[PDB]
Amino acid sequence: SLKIAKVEALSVAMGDPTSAFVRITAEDGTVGWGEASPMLGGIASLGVVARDIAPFLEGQEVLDHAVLLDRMMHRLVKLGPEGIATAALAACDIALWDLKGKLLGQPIYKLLGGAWRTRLPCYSSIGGNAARSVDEVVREVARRVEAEQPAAVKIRWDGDRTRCDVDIPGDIAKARAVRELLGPDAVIGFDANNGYSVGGAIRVGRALEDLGYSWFEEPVQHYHVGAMGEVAQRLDITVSAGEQTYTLQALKDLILSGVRMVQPDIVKMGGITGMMQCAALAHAHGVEFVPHQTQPGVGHFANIHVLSTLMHMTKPVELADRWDRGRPVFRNPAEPVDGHFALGDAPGLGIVVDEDELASRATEITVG
Amino acid sequence: SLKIAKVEALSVAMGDMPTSAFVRITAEDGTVGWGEASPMLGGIASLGVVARDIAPFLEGQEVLDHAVLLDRMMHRLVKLGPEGIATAALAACDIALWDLKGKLLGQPIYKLLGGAWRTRLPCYSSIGGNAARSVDEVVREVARRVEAEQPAAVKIRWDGDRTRCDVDIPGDIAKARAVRELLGPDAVIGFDANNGYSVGGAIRVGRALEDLGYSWFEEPVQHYHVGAMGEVAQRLDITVSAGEQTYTLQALKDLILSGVRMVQPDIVKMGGITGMMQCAALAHAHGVEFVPHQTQPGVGHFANIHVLSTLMHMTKPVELADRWDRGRPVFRNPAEPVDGHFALGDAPGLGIVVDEDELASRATEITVGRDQR
Amino acid sequence: SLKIAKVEALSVAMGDPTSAFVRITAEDGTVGWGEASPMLGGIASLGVVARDIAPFLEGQEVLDHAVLLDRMMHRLVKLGPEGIATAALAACDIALWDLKGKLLGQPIYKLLGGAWRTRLPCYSSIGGNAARSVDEVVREVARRVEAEQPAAVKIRWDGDRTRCDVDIPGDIAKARAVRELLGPDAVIGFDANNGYSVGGAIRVGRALEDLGYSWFEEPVQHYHVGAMGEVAQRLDITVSAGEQTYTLQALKDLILSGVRMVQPDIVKMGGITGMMQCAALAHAHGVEFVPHQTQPGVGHFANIHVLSTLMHMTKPVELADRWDRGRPVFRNPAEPVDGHFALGDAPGLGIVVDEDELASRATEITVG
Amino acid sequence: SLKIAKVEALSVAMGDMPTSAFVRITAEDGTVGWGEASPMLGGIASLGVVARDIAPFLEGQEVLDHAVLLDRMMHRLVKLGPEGIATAALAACDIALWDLKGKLLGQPIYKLLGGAWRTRLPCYSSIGGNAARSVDEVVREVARRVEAEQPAAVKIRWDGDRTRCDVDIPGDIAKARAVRELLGPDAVIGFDANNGYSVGGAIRVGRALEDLGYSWFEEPVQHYHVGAMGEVAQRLDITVSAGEQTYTLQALKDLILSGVRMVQPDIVKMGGITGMMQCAALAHAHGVEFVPHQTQPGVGHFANIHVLSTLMHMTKPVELADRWDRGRPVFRNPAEPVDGHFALGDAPGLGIVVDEDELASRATEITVGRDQR
Numbered sequence A, C: 001s002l003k004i005a006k007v008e009a010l011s012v013a014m015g016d017p018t019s020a021f022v023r024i025t026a027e028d029g030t031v032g033w034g035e036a037s038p039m040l041g042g043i044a045s046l047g048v049v050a051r052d053i054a055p056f057l058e059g060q061e062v063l064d065h066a067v068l069l070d071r072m073m074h075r076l077v078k079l080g081p082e083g084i085a086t087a088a089l090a091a092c093d094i095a096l097w098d099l100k101g102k103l104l105g106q107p108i109y110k111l112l113g114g115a116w117r118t119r120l121p122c123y124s125s126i127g128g129n130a131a132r133s134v135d136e137v138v139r140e141v142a143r144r145v146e147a148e149q150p151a152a153v154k155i156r157w158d159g160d161r162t163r164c165d166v167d168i169p170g171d172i173a174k175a176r177a178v179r180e181l182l183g184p185d186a187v188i189g190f191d192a193n194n195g196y197s198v199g200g201a202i203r204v205g206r207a208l209e210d211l212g213y214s215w216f217e218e219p220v221q222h223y224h225v226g227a228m229g230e231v232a233q234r235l236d237i238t239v240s241a242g243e244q245t246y247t248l249q250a251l252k253d254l255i256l257s258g259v260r261m262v263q264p265d266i267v268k269m270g271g272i273t274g275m276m277q278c279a280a281l282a283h284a285h286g287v288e289f290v291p292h293q294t295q296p297g298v299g300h301f302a303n304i305h306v307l308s309t310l311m312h313m314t315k316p317v318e319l320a321d322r323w324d325r326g327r328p329v330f331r332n333p334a335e336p337v338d339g340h341f342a343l344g345d346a347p348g349l350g351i352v353v354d355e356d357e358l359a360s361r362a363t364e365i366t367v368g
Numbered sequence B, D: 001s002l003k004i005a006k007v008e009a010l011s012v013a014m015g016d017m018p019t020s021a022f023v024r025i026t027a028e029d030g031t032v033g034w035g036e037a038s039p040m041l042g043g044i045a046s047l048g049v050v051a052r053d054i055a056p057f058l059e060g061q062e063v064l065d066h067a068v069l070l071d072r073m074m075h076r077l078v079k080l081g082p083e084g085i086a087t088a089a090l091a092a093c094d095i096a097l098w099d100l101k102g103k104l105l106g107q108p109i110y111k112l113l114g115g116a117w118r119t120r121l122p123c124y125s126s127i128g129g130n131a132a133r134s135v136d137e138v139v140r141e142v143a144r145r146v147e148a149e150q151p152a153a154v155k156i157r158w159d160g161d162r163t164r165c166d167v168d169i170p171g172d173i174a175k176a177r178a179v180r181e182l183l184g185p186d187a188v189i190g191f192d193a194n195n196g197y198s199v200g201g202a203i204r205v206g207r208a209l210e211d212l213g214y215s216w217f218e219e220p221v222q223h224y225h226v227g228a229m230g231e232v233a234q235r236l237d238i239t240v241s242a243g244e245q246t247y248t249l250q251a252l253k254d255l256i257l258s259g260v261r262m263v264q265p266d267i268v269k270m271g272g273i274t275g276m277m278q279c280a281a282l283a284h285a286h287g288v289e290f291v292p293h294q295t296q297p298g299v300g301h302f303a304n305i306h307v308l309s310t311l312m313h314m315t316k317p318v319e320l321a322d323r324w325d326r327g328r329p330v331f332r333n334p335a336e337p338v339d340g341h342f343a344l345g346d347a348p349g350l351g352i353v354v355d356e357d358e359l360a361s362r363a364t365e366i367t368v369g370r371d372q373r
């Protein structure tokens, strides 16, 4: 059966920022695309693909993705494997799923057992609010809501994680102004990006409850798993975490700590195969499954195939800043219509890459 | 794409326990998938749920949509328990849809599940009915099965009356001792109490099994006492296992949280292939062993080995239970170990081969409002 | 002493919906009536009675109900036994108690040690509110309150359990409108029928607390026992569950999880014998005992005999939708007067079946 | 005061495992500090993170500001995990800055850390690769290392394939037994499973090791199962240890809370000198033993012994792992026990002596965008 011929790690300049892609070519010339979270460009993950994963995958069977990549996980375990190595593995998983869908003539979600929905609501995820004035926060939220007509809005802080409890009153004032803009009905989330102490998180949480916010993402430093779950159990507003959780077992620990809404990211860990396992874990424990996803191309497509299979979808699909950067490398990147993403039925992921644009923007990451 | 044309629920006389419960799903192109429900009291109630509740919903739907279709059905059927009867009905349909899917896509199920770590799977001889036997009878039957099967491990099961408790602890220990003496000091041996002990009785037997070097201790207390099951697991050194009478992913989670570190749900009792893969993921998330219960020689065995071929950290062998000969004549290639292993082939779907005419002669269709045959 | 001659499993068309009854005839021609929860008609439970239970009971002594049926439970354990098998057993238990009361010339509650009350307050249990507009919810509650003069009102959602957190603001608006209708004093319960995530349940719970609601039934999926009890401990409003709990041990687990008001159903599990054990368990743990019961005939009578024996009755007896369907099969089905049920002293259950109506509406479920 | 001029990331061919990962930091006055990253798959990814991410930030900054500089970098690098690759990169830079600091201030690192309890540190012979050996081969290699090193303790490590589980428990116990027989009843012996067992398998091996009087039992289950690791630690009597695959102070806290009472983080995998001192404090706060993992004969060894010289309640010896001979010729004074001890000298900084020309001939610089050599 179908063998892997070539595995390429590609650093790609996006928009008119760099992303990190894996292109896997089968012996029949078919191609699958994967993506690794582009943290500091994703260069370290791309190096791990090129040096450590690619030589093993070449000549192996496309359909054996789970055995191949779980063997690789164990080979790479002493690289963490959190972060760099899990993202490298996730990218390879997504690419092998893309190839698999093409080989079998099916969209990935059909191979995953079917979709509950092929029109998926979005939420506008608006970052960089720590640095903005109140008027600037309101201006940007208004702009994106007008353009995207989302089912929900999330305002994210993206502050400096060496600092803590920097401007709680200002943060609350911004949350209040956003509530006044969007009206009493609006579904609004607040993402602290790890900005608070336990006590600071409680204080902000109570203010967000007074403002009717729906969820409160990453209130404390992600490394404090006990504190994350404690804050989750102490508050009424739904506390969420998981975007910086990179293994199934650490996700289990996060749930056991008290967190009831988890948000692992398909290009940071797991890929399609791992994210389905994470969904199963969440269903076993009665926790909401609301993936983190900020990339407009390959990662977005992997995310929506997985989310189309989720029975109890409780929050919309993330649409983060500067999603326009999906063009021109991709012909059909994330682009909401009537506040939804329309998942199609092309084989594999169904993402379409512009060959000439990619070539002009791509740097291959090779062994030394 | 490929639509479901017909769903049949079949009660089938097997071999020379005497009847099994199968689901045959026929697609619009005439291809057929086979599933199996645990044949508890014949599996007749499960077959009735298939015929009345599930079949009318699946007919006309897409084969590939199995997860959405069957999770929708689970929610329609939730007030039937759904533990036991309904989960086995759902499991049978899942297995049949996977068989159809493999045939549609031209791949064995393990390839579709992401690859096999192994296609030769070690077996263990699972030998039941020891409560009723004398010591010499236990030894004789174990020796017989071991000679025939060359297994990687042996499990002796009690299958006593569950209205009784702590019936004959000294005799049970004597049987365990005699089996150790037969098999030698190296042999991997498990003991399945089939829910026969109190917590105190279970501790007492557990310590005796530890002295005899037994490897695992299955279902020591009544399955309904989940707290007690996990307590006994944490109090003993020998690995306590349970899960064969656990029917949902959430109840499996509860069993793990109680303290159980080896879980044994059954692919024809709950979940089917799709659900068993989820259970495997849950076990991996929690660091517990995954050692499915499986006692049927045909469809259920094949589903079980496709799933187990995908398990990275396989720690115990595949179950081979009593009277596996009954796989024939309904099936042409039922479970039959070679050099102590099951050889998993590469035929599309399950790869199980049914003798159509034998099946026809032995099958009673369970229909809306009756039995036919 | 008195032997069982015949056990019949009967599917019966009700009103001018199908129910599931067990008729047991003793050797002297006396008859006892039982009922199994009519889930999808209760046909599977009726089949279990006919195939698995009836042949064992025939020729056995009526008075040996507990030994006979606990032996049957163990014979049937691998059928779950949750749901189908426990309902089949419950129906047989109720029928044997009816026969026992007739044989001994006593109403069942006297055999159970006496009644604290023979006039039992009701609550109007009004379902199908997920699908209604606010005005339709208010209209139906008003209609039933006018007719039934209940001691309390419960509004139930009965939504699609494949969906989650569908319309929290609308749900709260309906709860608010019902509070405004019934006034500040009114005792009102809200039954989510498993419609929320943990976080959604907390959000609705706080709104119900603001509206002075008395209890909050089945907020999360019943399978998430840990989450059910967590929600119960996190909120102030009394969270209740148990209607989808089918064994004494699983009821123990539900209590240990944190639930302080339990609602097992006499025709879903246990029958009279099992429900008395459940009441004992609740008393041991200091939890309220408020049975789920939605059937107007046999199940209602079994329920009120048991509830007449409950010392610390804290909530009224459930009176669910379309209770008029008790006629014409029964001559004296559930029918409140001055907001109460009047329990009489006829031997056994005291339910009166119209022979000709039953015969015209009954289909016997037989072995194949 | 003294500014950092240059940060170099070097992949170095060692001895005759074959390559190591070093960081050389040069101050504006020409003084040099040496650090090391755990050379997992050569440490190349860590070296790339040093070259691309850390080096440009450190160049021009004050040597003495190491903690603020590297904690700022940890936060810049947090989305790289930072477990494993990034923490080892940070550890290497910390060690190099401490070496520079000691040279600047004219003091050995242990003096700067508040004094040494001891400058002669007992060693233990850490002997790997026993999964693959026969019993006689295990005995032969242990006898060889013991004759050469005269250690205060011996640890036998398995280093098996982590995709496999409970592979050969009887054989493992036989090897442990043979080693006890070789070394005598008094000998302090540890057993390192390298993550080879299930919870049940770990309990079974643990009891056998207790019967053989073993002193500690390292990494019995997969490291990712933190709950299971601590559970096994609390269930057994033999001291269960872990931490070598734990990379943050908070994850070390979680490992302790799970039940582990002997922790073994590695100075070149995480923290460096600064972080290892914090880990020691955490262990002291919780009453757990602190017994670092360390397998490198040069820079990492020297960092390790400076820190361990400061540990009041030292309970186990310093690790001396396989092929320590590979310290030469790159280093002039790599780890080499004398009368079963390591002699810590008083040279400023680490006190490690590098052969410049050997280093040059064996070093490939890892730079932004490539390998050079």
Ligand SMILES: [Cl-]
Pocket (backbone or CB within 6 Å): A111, A112, B112, B113
């Ligand atoms: Cl597939």
Ligand SMILES: [Cl-]
Pocket (backbone or CB within 6 Å): A223, A224, A225, A226, A227, A228
């Ligand atoms: Cl914490």
Ligand SMILES: [Cl-]
Pocket (backbone or CB within 6 Å): A222, A241, A242, A243, A244, A245
């Ligand atoms: Cl996180």
Ligand SMILES: [Cl-]
Pocket (backbone or CB within 6 Å): B224, B225, B226, B227, B228, B229
């Ligand atoms: Cl229990």
Ligand SMILES: [Cl-]
Pocket (backbone or CB within 6 Å): B223, B242, B243, B244, B245, B246
């Ligand atoms: Cl079980």
Ligand SMILES: [Cl-]
Pocket (backbone or CB within 6 Å): A284, A285, A286, C223, C224, C225, C226, C227, C228
């Ligand atoms: Cl739960």
Ligand SMILES: [Cl-]
Pocket (backbone or CB within 6 Å): C222, C241, C242, C243, C244, C245
């Ligand atoms: Cl319930």
Ligand SMILES: [Cl-]
Pocket (backbone or CB within 6 Å): D112, D113
């Ligand atoms: Cl100092």
Ligand SMILES: [Cl-]
Pocket (backbone or CB within 6 Å): B285, B286, B287, D224, D225, D226, D227, D228, D229
């Ligand atoms: Cl764990």
Ligand SMILES: [Cl-]
Pocket (backbone or CB within 6 Å): D223, D242, D243, D244, D245, D246
């Ligand atoms: Cl570790």
Ligand SMILES: [Mg+2]
Pocket (backbone or CB within 6 Å): A225, A250, A253, D226, D251, D254
């Ligand atoms: Mg952790």
Ligand SMILES: [Mg+2]
Pocket (backbone or CB within 6 Å): B226, B251, B254, C225, C250, C253
């Ligand atoms: Mg349970």
